[PDB]
Amino acid sequence: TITARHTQYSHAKTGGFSQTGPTLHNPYKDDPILDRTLRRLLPESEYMRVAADLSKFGDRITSEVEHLGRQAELEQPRLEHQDAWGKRVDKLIVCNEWHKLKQICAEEGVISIGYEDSVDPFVRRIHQVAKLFLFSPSAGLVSCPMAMTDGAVKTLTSLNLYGKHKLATEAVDRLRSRDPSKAWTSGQWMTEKKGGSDVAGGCDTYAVQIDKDTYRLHGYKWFSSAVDADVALTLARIVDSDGNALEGSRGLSLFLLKIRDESGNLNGIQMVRLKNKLGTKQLPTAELLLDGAIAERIGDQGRGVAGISNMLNITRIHNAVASLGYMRRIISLARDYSTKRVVFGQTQSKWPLHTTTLAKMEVDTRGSMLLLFEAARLLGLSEAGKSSDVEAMMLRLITPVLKLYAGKQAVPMVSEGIECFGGQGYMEDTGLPTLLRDAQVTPIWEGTTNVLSLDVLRVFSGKENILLAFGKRVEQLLGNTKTEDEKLKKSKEAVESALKQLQKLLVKASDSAIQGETRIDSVARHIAFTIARIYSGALLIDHASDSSVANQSDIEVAYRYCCEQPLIDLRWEWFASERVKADREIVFDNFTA
Amino acid sequence: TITARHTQYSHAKTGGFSQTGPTLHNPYKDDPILDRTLRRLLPESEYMRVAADLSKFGDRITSEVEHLGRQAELEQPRLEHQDAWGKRVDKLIVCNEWHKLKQICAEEGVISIGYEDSVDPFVRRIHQVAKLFLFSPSAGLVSCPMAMTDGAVKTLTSLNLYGKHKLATEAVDRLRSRDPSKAWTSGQWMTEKKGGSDVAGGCDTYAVQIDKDTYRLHGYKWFSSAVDADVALTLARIVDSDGNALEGSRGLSLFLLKIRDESGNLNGIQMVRLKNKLGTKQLPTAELLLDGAIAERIGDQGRGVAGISNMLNITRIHNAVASLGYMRRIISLARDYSTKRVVFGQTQSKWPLHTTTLAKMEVDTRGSMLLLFEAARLLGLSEAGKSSDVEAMMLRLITPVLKLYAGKQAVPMVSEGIECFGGQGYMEDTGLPTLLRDAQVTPIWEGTTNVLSLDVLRVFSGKENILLAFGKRVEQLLGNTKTEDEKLKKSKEAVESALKQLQKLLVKASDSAIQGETRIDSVARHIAFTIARIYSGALLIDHASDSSVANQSDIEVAYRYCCEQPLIDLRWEWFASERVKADREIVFDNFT
Amino acid sequence: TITARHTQYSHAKTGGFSQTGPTLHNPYKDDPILDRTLRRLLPESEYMRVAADLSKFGDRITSEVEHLGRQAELEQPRLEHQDAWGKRVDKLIVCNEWHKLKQICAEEGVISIGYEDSVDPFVRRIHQVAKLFLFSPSAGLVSCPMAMTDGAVKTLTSLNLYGKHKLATEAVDRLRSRDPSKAWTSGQWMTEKKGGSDVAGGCDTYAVQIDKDTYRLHGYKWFSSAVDADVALTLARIVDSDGNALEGSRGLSLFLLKIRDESGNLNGIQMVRLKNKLGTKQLPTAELLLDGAIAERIGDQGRGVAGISNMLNITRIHNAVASLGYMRRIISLARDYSTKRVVFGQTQSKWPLHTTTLAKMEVDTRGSMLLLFEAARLLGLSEAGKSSDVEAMMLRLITPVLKLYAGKQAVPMVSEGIECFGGQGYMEDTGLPTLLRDAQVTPIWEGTTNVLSLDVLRVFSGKENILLAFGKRVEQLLGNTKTEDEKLKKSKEAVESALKQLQKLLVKASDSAIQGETRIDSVARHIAFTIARIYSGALLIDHASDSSVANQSDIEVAYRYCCEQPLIDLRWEWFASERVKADREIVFDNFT
Ligand SMILES: Cc1cc2nc3c(=O)[nH]c(=O)nc-3n(C[C@H](O)[C@H](O)[C@H](O)COP(=O)(O)OP(=O)(O)OC[C@H]3O[C@@H](n4cnc5c(N)ncnc54)[C@H](O)[C@@H]3O)c2cc1C
Ligand SMILES: Cc1cc2nc3c(=O)[nH]c(=O)nc-3n(C[C@H](O)[C@H](O)[C@H](O)COP(=O)(O)OP(=O)(O)OC[C@H]3O[C@@H](n4cnc5c(N)ncnc54)[C@H](O)[C@@H]3O)c2cc1C
Ligand SMILES: Cc1cc2nc3c(=O)[nH]c(=O)nc-3n(C[C@H](O)[C@H](O)[C@H](O)COP(=O)(O)OP(=O)(O)OC[C@H]3O[C@@H](n4cnc5c(N)ncnc54)[C@H](O)[C@@H]3O)c2cc1C
Description:
This is part of a larger assembly, with three copies of chain A.
Chain A lengths: L1 E2 L30 H8 L2 H31 L3 E5 L5 E6 L2 H12 L13 H15 L7 H16 L7 H10 L10 E4 L9 H4 L3 E6 L2 E12 L5 E8 L5 E2 L6 E7 L10 E6 L10 E14 L5 H6 L2 H27 L3 E2 L2 E2 L4 H33 L4 H31 L12 H8 L9 H14 L3 H14 L6 H27 L11 H22 L6 H12 L14 H10 L6
Parallel strand pairs in A: 4-7, 5-7
Antiparallel strand pairs in A: 2-3, 5-6, 6-11, 7-9, 9-11, 10-11, 12-13
Helix pairs in contact in A: 2-3, 2-4, 4-9, 4-10, 5-6, 5-9, 9-10, 9-11, 9-12, 10-11, 10-16, 10-17, 11-12, 11-13, 11-14, 11-16, 13-16, 14-15, 14-16, 15-16, 15-17, 16-17
Bound molecules: flavin-adenine dinucleotide (3 copies).
């Protein structure tokens, strides 16, 4: 009979308060412009169908995909070179959610949709891009094999192999399949140690003929993402019968291989290690040593870079989607959080300074958003055989410009976004820093900002009059400006003036370069930034002029995008070659030689 | 007898090539502007002493500290609530290299130099900040307790407690010590669940009087870094004899406590958990449950906020140091890499696009670097009693401005830097991403960009003196311009034009009728950025114009900073209340 | 044009050789004695049903479960106190394969089979234990909640609560279900800091009446496994209306609770931490702080201990299953390996020393295996109402004996087994060490070897009936001996001689004068081992003597078990009180 001690067992008191975090709303319904943009680009019959599918998928993002993608971050891939008995197996361990995510992509047709023969090509790419844009920031980086997979189908089909070449026909069918138990994905192994940007100088993989169009590959692939994929595309240097190869782009042939034989065993490949990455941690990225890998030559010998170009538009568009996804997502989470976090006696949402900051992020995102859907429209026209000459040229211009500009927007924007949450933004267990770490891949891979900026110049250097064509496209967009609204008129005038300046500078540049004292490369980024802003601005304007869909916000946005920041930031003197000498004196001041 | 099988055992061949990564060079010698800046600011005999100490420390950084900081990232702090036998212990497990870093801070006087009696305060804060600046990007986040440590010293001293108050006097003395065996660090525990930033409205810790000036604390600290520190400052509401307290700022009193007791046992504190952080992973940051932690009140009752205000200038300066450290570091690594990485047949260093990219990063860095040293200058003066009115006012203005601007430059700059490395910049095992993850703390803690922008507005609202003095300071800097140089001249004009326009807009927004339709808080960031750019611009001109040290890069950077990006980005129509409504519509379009 | 470099990219060569590891064969078909034992014990039509179900499950074990169990070791449970936003949640993170294992338990009726109304209880517990035995070494410790689950069913039923008590009836029904979507598991939270084993003196949990039969619990559970269960049984002291309670066994009442509420939220419970365990790493074991956990009292007030006593037989049987599972498993793997590993020019299987080592392990395993099935037999009989006096008494005696003996055989046996593999037996990635680390739980939990040895003594002290009945049971087994066989005959004699000597020593120790100078607790283990060996011996003889099933190995094993190691290791002089003094001196020599 002692005194009871119930009182001596008691949970810790912590004050009662804890902050409610942000809510992810249905990302199709909650998106500011996506639905409206679709109202305008698609025909009525197709809009209903597409909206319904996307809106439903929105609900799957919130109830299922988000959680899956999160788990893929929490349970990262591993590699075991060996089993326990001394046997080399290169076992890749990836979590169930990654696999489930690949299956949802199949079921949801994230690839299929972009190729469905019963649907108009222009419709389907716009549907697909909208779907990828809902998926991407919840994807746990399954978005990356989706991109390479789309790019693979694209490449194999542009080379006219589907129906004719055994493995490519099978690949195409499987890569496009909506059957989760049949569907394939693809990798893409271009980057090597000596160069990634530079494939003609970097690639030291060699192909020895076994028989006919079947070769052995031997080389080292320095980044190879999604090694759980079923097939891959890669470049290599065919070895002629005297044991020799060609340097440069002219040495490179293109090959398709199955990653694993029918026994589940690696096909002449050893995984040297998995990368330890700032972000995309969900994604297994390996270094590969090829040593006898059996592969099939596709496309013409020495025509390897040409072969894979066929997919540029694709991959880059997907990359842009990712960038934009991160941007939209942080805004979406931020603004929601803004209705719940009390500071100095009211919700963040009430403080002018807070809304100013977010509004500017909105403005910039909308611009690029519409640039993205222009790209998707254009790709689709091109795939239908219905491109005007101008639309064909715009497709070639817009893709690198889009990838690099959205690319460069993304980290600063997402960085600003997480700061909206204060300290919480910085805590990995909220899910928010993932968005930053993963966003930062987007300006780096598939071409850095500056390498793509050169690609933009190389688009110009090819020469049907890209620039004139750029001019006409802009003019079309400006032609139905609601000039009666004072702000849209001013906007139209800003875009117009900027276009006119850019033309003048590039005309000037083009003349002066034989004289030696002019280096257009040096300002390639500013050039590419300018095109993006002009193009994006024109689209916002056209968008805000459709009063069947436009609201007031659309008008404010067009105005702010066009007139409250420079459309062109580019000066003649930055072209001067002397400028380059000044550049290096600055950079290399006191550098220890 | 059998055929040998030496051929069957063979390492893998992987092609012979692998890329040389970047070299970290002596960061005092390699820095493009730090030596020249010190040359101008210090009298020659102090410069010589200071340079030699830093040059040497540069070597210690490449030979030792860098590696130490890297290891503190590779071996992150852990926390164990219980020992194995049911005992609550809260064991904080932190790697040896963290500890070693703390001792190097003592050995190298990273705190001491700033308070050395026998050196002039001017000299000494310049020297200190320079040293803090070399240290910071190699510190594995030991930079953070150093900041909190310096702030603690400043706070304790400014309250006139040295000599009088036993614990604060022991604290000051140990926080400043060069003896690794004795030196102390401090934490600072303000932030709680309901508010960081907003401490007046978010602080829900309570202090019950034990005897005279000794209290027990009960509350929950939501972020508390360097829980391996020895002392900490913190705020709490004293509970009266009806068992009641005061809401708002007026309730809060400031307290000093020892973290652990003579026994190594936590003083009424539990560690609930360590934070899982994007960056500053080296640094142990915990949540703390205070339940009878024994603490000495310092400063006056209900004057807790004022009390810790004395340390702002210093904390903020340290923060800016961090930002700039990352900026300088990435540029330094990248430039080096650029002489080693071949792309299309040449090293990156020969591609104009690549150096265009870098030059612009350099330009912006230098502007802020000088801004940093002007703050250091102004702080040292303040502490010597020699400040003019102008200079006293500039210390108040520059500190929040500097922190927020450098803070907001840092992530986009470091992001661009890691992109110079291509895919390798994205690999954690290079050490490069750490720079970015760690840089991202800087615009967030100790006030977000926008919160500090509001502070900037408080500094000058509605006190016309502050901006006129900014005016005067700018003119002092510009009056030295080598106007013979066309670029410096245009530069000067640009600064003039911008300063003017700024002053006009703020006068106009001050108009007591204009105000109904006018929200200046809305553009607080633009305002603060403009101040930043104008100040920094002017400082770059002054620097370029000193012929005893400047070179041609100096002129060129000054020209670019001032004339090739707007110094003022601020329009009258952005002050309109109506605009706010438009902002909201844009932001909450389709919001569900 | 350049010279190709295909020769410069080449995998490493490592000599061509690597050892084939062991194969897990269908563990029902491969088992040397399980099928024959079932053949003898079950009527043919039940055997046929049972074998087919097990044979099939054998395949499911090699094709699926094994891999699942391995994964539950590779992906250990984790616990998160807080979510990211300051909320206390106690999230238990356990791998998919654990969950999958639990569903296979439901699908395969690992609990259901033991309670199936339409099958005879005799049959069904034999079938169940057989199934438990195939499952156990592949279960990734899901075996543990299965034991606690079966014990819960038995307890709830034996208290005559099925039909009457709402929660217990729902519980019983869900614990027995084959529907993965509905099936439940149970925990059992007895052990506290002051005592496991000693619950009467160590339980410091308190139950305050809410209403009628519903109470709130406040206390600290020091070990609580399978916190992913749905319900749990536990003991606590009811607090009276003076706010007082009863020390000792009499205070304790037994309670039934739901672990989480309709919302998935813990019922007044926090998880303080998960244990870091030598083995059973698959299994989530936590320490629990009960603070207002809502619970239904079941059984009578102060009858908590009696209440849970009904489940001992069953829990103990499950434990022995585990021990034997590990023993069988290692032997099975090792023998296989032995047909694949060449040492000095032959497979290990051809080296007599190697097979001598294994034979002795086999001999001992089989003895205990039969002991296990005799327990199963006796349990099923008890539950059918058909037990003779002898058989009722043998159930009580055999259960602690079986658990402790198998428990003490297991680590040294599995240790010898892993040594058969040489260095590979010491490698975690083979899966083999898991066997040893997991086996080591078995002599420790649910009573240590010595604590259960004291229970064995309680079973028979001072109740002369129990040993006479052991006597009778042994004679029943021996009366069937094929005495025509010289080995079985000698065997029989050995058992006789030993049983006799045992009975004499215990009579002698019972002498009320002898007792002053006599400590029987001192030799409790020897006593219990002797009972074990005698019982098992006799069972091996009986088995060997059934010509319809036995083979020559059976005879030989029986002979070796009985005649090649002492069945009794127990001398009269070890009972002496004086001896105790000598024991202490030896043990505490130079103790400081
Ligand atoms: C790694 C780390 C370690 C830390 N360590 C410590 C430590 O040791 N000690 C300590 O005291 N603190 C520490 N902190 C606290 C840090 O200072 C806070 O996180 C900071 O106050 C940011 O605010 P918050 O976290 O309370 O978020 P909140 O202030 O809730 O939200 C910030 C957001 O609200 C906005 N906002 C707030 N007020 C206004 C306004 N009036 N007008 C417009 N917008 C507004 C901001 O602009 C920002 O977007 C740490 C933080 C981090 C990330
Ligand atoms: C997470 C991740 C996953 C990846 N997965 C894959 C994959 O599955 N398959 C694959 O093939 N690749 C993959 N990559 C590789 C990626 O495409 C390369 O990183 C990219 O090609 C850049 O190449 P690099 O890393 O060699 O950069 P480098 O080109 O060595 O360096 C880039 C820097 O050099 C500058 N530069 C380069 N050329 C020029 C020039 N001509 N003029 C001026 N400046 C120039 C760039 O602007 C940039 O600053 C991956 C990368 C990452 C980060
Ligand atoms: C992995 C694991 C999980 C567990 N999970 C649970 C669970 O879910 N629920 C639960 O209730 N319990 C659980 N237990 C508790 C387990 O039954 C106890 O650990 C057990 O009671 C052993 O005793 P103890 O831990 O209290 O040690 P103690 O009993 O303090 O010490 C045991 C030692 O004392 C000796 N000893 C004790 N009494 C005597 C005596 N009278 N004479 C001579 N020697 C004596 C024993 O022989 C032994 O040497 C778990 C244990 C483990 C290891």
